[PDB]
Amino acid sequence: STGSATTTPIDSLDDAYITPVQIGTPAQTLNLDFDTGSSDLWVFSSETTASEVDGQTIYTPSKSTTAKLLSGATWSISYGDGSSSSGDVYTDTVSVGGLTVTGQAVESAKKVSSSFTEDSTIDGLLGLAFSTLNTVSPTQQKTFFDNAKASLDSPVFTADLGYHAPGTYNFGFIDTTAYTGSITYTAVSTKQGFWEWTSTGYAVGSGTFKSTSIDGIADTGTTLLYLPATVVSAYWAQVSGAKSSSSVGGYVFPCSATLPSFTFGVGSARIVIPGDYIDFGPISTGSSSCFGGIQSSAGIGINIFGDVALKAAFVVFNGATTPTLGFASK
Ligand SMILES: Cn1cnc(C[C@H](N)C(=O)O)c1
Q1: Of 39, 166, 173, 267, which cross-links 133 as Cys (Cβ 3.0–4.6 Å)?
Q2: What lines the ligand 1 site, CB under 6 Å?
Q3: Domains in the chain, ordered, with CATH?
C-alpha cells in the first residue's frame, strides 16, 4: 500500500501545514497538523468543551459505525510552545491520502489550550515521531505510521513542504520526480523518541562552511529553525540592525533588510535555505521590525530543524529497523 496527501499552509507565513484526513464510517474529514515531533493523533470532537471550540471541524464518534471507545484510556500532552490538550480515546478507521489503517487510536479532546482554540484552521494533530512518546495511559498507543508500516510498500514517509505553497506527504514510497540530485541519508537516534540526527555544520550566506556537529530533531510541527546561540549569533551578525529582543521573544531585524541564506550540512551534502524563507514579517501589523526565522535553542534544550529548514528539502523519514533521515534538494 501507499498514500499521498497534499499539505497546505494555514496562513501567509507558513506557520503550520494542514493535511486532510478521513476518520470513521462514513468518512469525517478533518484537517490535521502532521507533526514529526510528537506521537499522538488527537482531534477536536463532540466531547471538546464547547467554549474551547471556535470554528474547528469536530470528529463525532457516535456518527461513526466503526468507532469504539477504548475503555479506560486517557491522554494528556504538552508541547514545546506551552500548548496542551487532553481527553479520552476511540479506535476507528483512519485514511490518509488513500492509505487506510483500521483500529487506529483517535484521541478525542475534552480540553484544549487557548492557542488551539484560536487556530480555527487546525482540527487536531497527527503525530509521526516514535510511538514511545505516545501519551495514552494505561496502554500506550501506536502512531498512524507505525500501524501502517505492515501494509506499506516500503517503511517510509516523506515530507515535501512548500514555501508559500502546498506540498505533499507520501507514505510507503519515494517519489523520484519530487527532488533533484541524490538523497543523502544520515543516522537517526530514537533514544529520545524523536527523528534525532546530527548535522555536519553550517554556512551563513556566501561565507565559508563551518564543520561542527549539531544534534537536533526533524520536526514538521515546529515553524522555525532553532539552533545553538553561537550559530544564530553568527547568522544575525550579517544583518544590519538585527538584535535579540527580550520584549518580542527572539531575534528581530529591520524589515528593510535583505536576509542572507543559511546552509546546513547533511553528511557531505548541503541544504540551502533561501534568505526569503527566514523572513517572518512584521512583529505586529504595520511594524517596521520583522521577526526572524532562525532563533536560539538555548532556552529549549534541543535544536529543532522545523519547517523553515525542512521546506528547503525533500525529506525522507525512513522507519526501517535501522531508521535514517534523507535530505535532497528540490
Ligand atoms: C501542537 N504543537 C506541536 N509542535 C508545536 C510547536 C510549535 N508549532 C512551535 O513552532 O513552537 C506545537
Answers
A1: 39
A2: 35, 37-38, 79-81, 83, 125, 221-223, 306
A3: 5-174 (2.40.70.10), 175-330 (2.40.70.10)
